Structure 1
Amino acid sequence: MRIYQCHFCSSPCYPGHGIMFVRNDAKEFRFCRSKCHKAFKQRRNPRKLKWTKAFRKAAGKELAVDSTLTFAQRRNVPVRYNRELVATTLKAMARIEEIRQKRERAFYKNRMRGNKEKDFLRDKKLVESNPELLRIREVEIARKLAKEQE
C-alpha cells in the first residue's frame, strides 16, 4: 500500500482512486482524477495550467527548496525493521510537518506583504477623486443624525 502523487497536478492518489496509463516505454502515469487524465490526453501543459503544483512551484507561488522538503525520498535500499527507529520516525514526521507548515506560512506572508500599502493608496486616490459622492454621504449622515436626535 502506497500513496501516489498525480502525474498532472501532484495531488495524492489513494488506493482505488484515479486511473493509470502505461506507455510503450513502461512508464506509468497515475492520475488522481478524470480531469487530470483528460487534460493529459488533450496534451495540455501542467506547468501552464495555474491550478497545478507544477505551475505553482515554477511560478514561485509556494516554496520549493527547503530543508524540510528533503526528508521524503524513495528508499531503494531497505533497512531492517527496528521498533524504536519506527517510533522515532513517527514522531519526526509530525515534527517535520509542523515546521514545514510554519515555514510555508512565513513564505506566503513574505509574498503577500505590500497589499495593505497598495490598498491604502488606491483608497486615498478614490477618495481624492470623488468629492461629490462624499458630499452626498455627508448630507445623508447629517440627516440620519438629525433623525436620531429628534
Structure 2
Amino acid sequence: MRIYQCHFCSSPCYPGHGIMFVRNDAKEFRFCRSKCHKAFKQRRNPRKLKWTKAFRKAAGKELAVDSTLTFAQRRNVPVRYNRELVATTLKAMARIEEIRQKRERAFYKNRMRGNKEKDFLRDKKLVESNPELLRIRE
C-alpha cells in the first residue's frame, strides 16, 4: 500500500481512487479526483489556482518550510524492520503530527494577527459616518 500525493493538489491519494496519467516522458502523474485531472488536462498552472496547496505554499498562506516536515521523506534506503523501531516510529509520528499541528496553528495566528485593529477601525468609520441612523435608533 502507498498513499500518493496529488500532482495538482498534493492531497493524499488512497489506493483505488482518482486517475493516473503516464506521458511519453516515462513519468506518472496522479490526480486524486476528476476535478484535478480535468484541470490538468486544460494545461492550468496549480500555482495560479487558489484552491490547491501549491498556491498556498507559494502565497505563504500556510507554513511552507518547517523542521517537522523533514521527517517525511522518500526512503530509497530501506530498514531492517526492527520491532522496537516500529513502536518508536509509531510514537514519533504522532508526536510529530501534534507538533506540526501546533506550529501550523501558531503560523495561522501570526498571519491573522492585526485583523482586530482593522475591524475596530472599520467599525469606528461606520459609526462616525452614520449619525442620522444612530439618532433614529435611539
The answer to whether TM tops 0.5 is yes
Gapped regions of structure 1 (runs ≥ 5): 137-148
Percent identity (aligned): 99
- Deviation digits for residues 101-133 of structure 1, max 9, x if unmatched? 000000000000010000000000110000000
- Deviation digits for residues 49-92 of structure 1, max 9, x if unmatched? 00011100000000011110100000111111100000000000
- Flag the structure with larger Rg: 1
1:65 is paired with a residue whose SS is coil
What residue in structure 1 maps to residue 70 of structure 2?
70
- Deviation digits for residues 6-29 of structure 1, max 9, x if unmatched? 000111100100000000111100
RMSD: 2.2
Normalised TM-score (structure 2): 0.98
Q: For residues 122 and 21 of structure 1, what CA distance do their matches in structure 2 show? A: 50
What is the CA distance between 1:46 and its match in structure 2? Answer: 0.3
2:91 is paired with a residue whose SS is helix
Q: For residues 81 and 65 of structure 1, what CA distance do their matches in structure 2 show? A: 29
Q: After TM superposition, what 4+ stretches of structure 1 lie above 6 angstroms from structure 2?
A: none
Gapped regions of structure 2 (runs ≥ 5): none
**How many residue pairs end up in the alignment?**
138
